[PDB]
Design a protein around this ligand. Structure first.
Ligand code: HEM
Length: 390
């Protein structure tokens, strides 16, 4: 008779009903919208170790929910394989990802956010954020990641808009795809020749051209790569914003001394924890966890939020306090699955929020609390429309 909660309490996030299911059914049973039964974990350490158990992988029956489906045995998406197929992709790509690398694009991520703003304020209007800033950056961040060039960014921003979201036609969606990959291969072939030092560059030269880089396979992952970031951060940005945006104290601290958003972005990431439902893992075996053991071959997701607001982790978890000692959160992943992406997802996230309140201080909502609208369509969380001016 059981369900998994939207909730989201709204305001801000996210625990919903979980307070009860955190203290008590620490592993309670709950139906998925597909009415397949499965298991759900809500206590910080439960959520984490559970996550990096030896025996927990992704694959065939019976995980997640998307109507549909344990089908397909869609190949790849390697973000739902266990090892040794999944690892050889994950690692195929880490060396690129890293930090020494990620803090490097510090000037180009800055650059880009700045140039996108240049227009924000130039076409003026009381405009929607999510669509306008929020997405804009996100994509373009990832452009800067994959070496995507000059301003064939709308060559790009477009097959994103189309391909990804709401309504097609299937053919004319499938047509979007056509470009994205005309684009990619464009590049995939181009960096074989004059290889720059970006993500196609990394994947092509080191791995591709001499390894099990099979140009079937690249585009695949480059696919799975863009799909990491467009929706998930855009999410974390425009929500993070709306938080700040309606609770002035928060900008406050962040202005007295702007050496914060780092701590802030970690803190928001935790507290917003929009990444909630990680995959879901089928339990490889029976597994002890606060003793209630999870049956061999069952569905078990790990609620990132539930865990992110567990007091066993850190005191007073609702409070968006920025000067916490202790916030080894995991709005990102835990264990060999964890968000490879997140080093970006931080520069994405600070340069984005940072500047919003540098260059455009107190913009405000065009809309009203009572017509702001939160997306809920993917499990990764976000907002449909956010409406502002300055
Ligand atoms: C702030 C926004 C983001 C959030 C909240 C987020 C959250 C997460 C979480 C919780 C996971 C766990 C996956 C698992 O269960 O193993 C994950 C996986 C992953 N993320 Fe992100 N992510 C964000 C941005 C990004 C971006 C922009 C990228 C790159 C485009 C990225 C790359 C990845 C990859 C490659 C995986 C799968 C790793 C693997 O299983 O090999 N992330 N993400």
């Amino acid at each position: 008779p059981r369900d998994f909660p939207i909730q989201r309490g709204c305001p801000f996030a996210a625990p919903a009903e979980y307070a009860a299911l955190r203290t008590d059914d620490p592993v309670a049973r709950v139906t998925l919208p597909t009415r397949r039964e499965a298991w759900v974990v809500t206590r910080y350490d439960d959520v984490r170790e559970l996550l990096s158990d030896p025996r927990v992988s992704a694959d065939i029956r019976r995980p997640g929910f998307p109507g549909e489906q344990e089908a397909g045995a869609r190949f790849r998406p390697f973000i739902r394989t266990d090892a040794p197929e999944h690892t050889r992709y994950r690692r195929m790509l880490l060396p690129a990802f890293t930090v020494r690398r990620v803090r490097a694009m510090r000037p180009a991520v800055q650059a880009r956010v700045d140039e996108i703003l240049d227009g924000m304020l130039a076409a003026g209007g009381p405009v929607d954020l999510v669509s306008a800033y929020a997405n804009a950056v996100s994509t373009s961040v990832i452009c800067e990641l994959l070496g995507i060039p000059r301003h064939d960014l709308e060559f790009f921003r477009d097959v994103t808009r189309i391909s990804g979201s709401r309504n097609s036609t299937a053919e004319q969606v499938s047509e979007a795809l056509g470009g994205l990959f005309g684009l990619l291969g464009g590049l995939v072939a181009e960096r074989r020749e004059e290889p720059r030092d970006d993500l196609i560059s990394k994947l092509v030269t080191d791995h591709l051209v001499p390894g099990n880089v099979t140009t079937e396979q690249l585009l695949s992952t480059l696919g799975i790569t863009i799909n990491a970031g467009r929706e998930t951060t855009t999410s974390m940005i425009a929500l993070s914003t709306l938080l700040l945006l309606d609770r002035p104290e928060l900008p406050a601290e962040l202005r007295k001394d702007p050496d914060l958003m780092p701590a802030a972005v970690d803190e928001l990431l935790r507290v917003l924890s929009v990444a909630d439902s990680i995959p879901l893992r089928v339990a490889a075996e029976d597994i002890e966890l606060s003793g209630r053991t999870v049956p061999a071959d069952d569905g078990v997701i790990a609620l990132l939020a539930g865990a992110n607001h567990d007091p066993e982790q850190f005191d007073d978890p609702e409070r968006v306090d920025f000067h916490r000692t202790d916030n080894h959160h995991v709005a990102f992943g835990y264990g060999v699955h964890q968000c490879v992406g997140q080093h970006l997802a931080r520069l994405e996230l600070e340069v984005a929020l940072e500047t919003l309140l540098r260059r455009v201080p107190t913009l405000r909502l065009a809309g009203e609390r009572d017509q702001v609208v939160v997306k809920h369509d993917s499990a990764t969380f976000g907002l449909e429309e956010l409406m502002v001016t300055w």
